[PDB]
Design a protein around this ligand. Structure first.
Ligand SMILES: Cc1cc2nc3c(=O)[nH]c(=O)nc-3n(C[C@H](O)[C@H](O)[C@H](O)COP(=O)(O)OP(=O)(O)OC[C@H]3O[C@@H](n4cnc5c(N)ncnc54)[C@H](O)[C@@H]3O)c2cc1C
Length: 295
């Protein structure tokens, strides 16, 4: 029932770009694009939490073909238009430093994707992943801990849960649990999907809580920049009490390195009741209730 590897690298699906929109507003850092592809003429199906691969054109420095890079699917199974014909990605352009040969290095696939024109054909493989799947239990609690483009799987959950057109398209899933997104970004113009996230929080104030950690605008208690681990420590007691519920699932997605500060906050909270978090967390992973995708 979970689609996996309907397309593979040796014969990928050739989709077309429908749109390529910027998500970072003026005054923000970097480039993050929302890219929608046309899936008609193929049999690519997917569900929420999965990833697809993109094969960029060209060769590396050794003259070998460029391999695929994985990207979290940013749309629900129905696509952004709820017509079951499209798939969306949330792609940040990668670029970096001088202690890595030259001046500015541009990431191959992310530069390729963020500057791709509507009408362009793209090689798409997948879907892949069973680690970030949403339970069909409408009474689940869902804690979502995201930084940057780790917002992508979270957007697929929230849209399925809260969009009017999704609710009408998924009669079997009418969410009525509680979900809490803690979203870490550097600036307010960097809050990907800000308007849509904040509309959900207005319509469903008892089912969705939205917390930001904005590091260039907020300070933690120690005087440093506000990062997501600082917001998690602020609410560590509350987060631990929700995690104790049998219905609660936790999702962590973003760049690698956020997990260590989430654990240290939850460890101190758990210790107060004689629980060692690292052993409780092993049981949550085994039970399928602790979901991590960092990169
Ligand atoms: C499951 C999964 C899901 C992902 N989802 C997304 C998503 O939704 N959105 C998204 O934007 N990305 C996502 N990523 C990352 C994405 O796959 C690519 O790694 C990323 O886009 C960069 O690829 P590239 O082709 O642009 O870079 P490459 O051209 O391969 O450049 C990357 C290489 O350069 C180096 N490098 C990178 N950063 C630095 C640095 N700061 N300093 C020094 N060297 C560095 C490393 O050698 C790295 O292997 C995901 C990754 C995985 C594994």
């Amino acid at each position: 029932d979970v689609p996996v590897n309907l397309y593979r690298p040796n014969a990928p699906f050739i989709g077309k770009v429908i749109s390529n929109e910027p998500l970072v507003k003026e005054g923000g850092i970097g480039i993050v694009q929302h890219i929608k592809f046309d899936l008609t003429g193929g049999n690519l199906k997917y569900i929420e939490g999965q990833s697809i691969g993109i094969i960029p054109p060209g060769v590396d420095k050794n003259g070998k073909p460029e391999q695929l890079r994985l990207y979290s699917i940013a749309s629900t199974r129905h696509g952004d238009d709820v017509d079951d014909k499209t798939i969306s990605l949330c792609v940040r352009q990668l670029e970096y430093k001088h202690p890595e040969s030259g001046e500015t290095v541009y990431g191959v696939c992310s530069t390729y994707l963020t500057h791709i024109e509507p009408g362009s054909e793209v090689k798409i493989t997948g879907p892949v992943g069973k680690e970030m799947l949403l339970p069909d239990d409408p009474e689940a609690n869902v804690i979502m801990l995201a930084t940057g483009t780790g917002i992508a799987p979270m957007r697929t959950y929230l849209w399925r849960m809260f969009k009017d057109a999704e609710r009408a398209a998924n009669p079997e899933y009418q969410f009525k649990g509680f979900s809490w997104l803690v979203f870490g970004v550097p600036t307010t113009p960097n809050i990907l999907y800000k308007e849509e996230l904040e509309e959900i929080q207005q319509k469903y104030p008892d089912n969705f809580r939205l917390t930001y950690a904005i590091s260039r605008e907020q300070k933690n208690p120690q005087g440093g920049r506000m990062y997501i681990q600082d917001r998690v420590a602020e609410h560590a007691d509350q987060l631990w009490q929700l995690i104790k519920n049998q219905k609660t699932h936790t999702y962590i997605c973003g760049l690698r390195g956020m997990e260590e500060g989430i654990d240290a906050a939850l460890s101190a909270a758990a210790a107060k009741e004689g629980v060692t978090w690292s052993d409780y967390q092993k049981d949550l992973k085994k039970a399928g209730r602790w979901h991590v995708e960092t990169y």
